[PDB]
Amino acid sequence: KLSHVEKDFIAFYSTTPHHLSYRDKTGGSYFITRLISCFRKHACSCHLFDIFLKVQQSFEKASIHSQMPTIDRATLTRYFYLFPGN
């Protein structure tokens, strides 16, 4: 049967190309910590892209050690709802 070669991928990097990503010895990676937090709060009602966008929104204000997580090489054709508990 006929099918695409590449489809249904999405990548969420911790920062932009060419740039450093930071990590706390006492808490782990800032990006991973924010990602888990947004998932715990919003996975029950938001699809994956909106969750990622909320993570990106939490990094909008520039800090002294700024990161900007980016969505990359995304070929999702539908909304990805996780329906936690179902």
Binding site: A11, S21, G28, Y81, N86
Partner: protein
Amino acid sequence: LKLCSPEEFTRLCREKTQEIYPIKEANGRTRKALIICNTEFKHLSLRYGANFDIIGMKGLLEDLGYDVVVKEELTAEGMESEMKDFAALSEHQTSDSTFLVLMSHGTLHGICGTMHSEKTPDVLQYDTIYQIFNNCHCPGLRDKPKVIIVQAARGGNSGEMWIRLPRNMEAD
């Protein structure tokens, strides 16, 4: 993690059937997720607190219904073989999605293996990950969401500047 009520699950499946990925019921479901993390390197700085990212991501993915495979301290070739091994798991046929979490030091176009250095590059290109898991080489995950989470530097430059490191903070 607060759960989605069954009434909302049936509501979204009725209102937006064509617009959302189909979610398999948790009965005969075998969701698999892969975590690859490198902490100790031959030449690079030890990634203190990387264990704080493993269990948190492993606990999150488990709360989401995924069985989490954790592989640590791998070279670039080690990462590639573990990914090919994970991509061929028969459990993907009875799954609806997968998560791929990669955490290590990083380069512009790849993630570093344990042996990486300026003189001894040990890098797995992110482009190779897509080849391993695309519709050609991963039949179990065809038409199913494949989410890639990457915690790593993408270069050596700072991500901020002024327009007209701290002791507990490290760089990947």
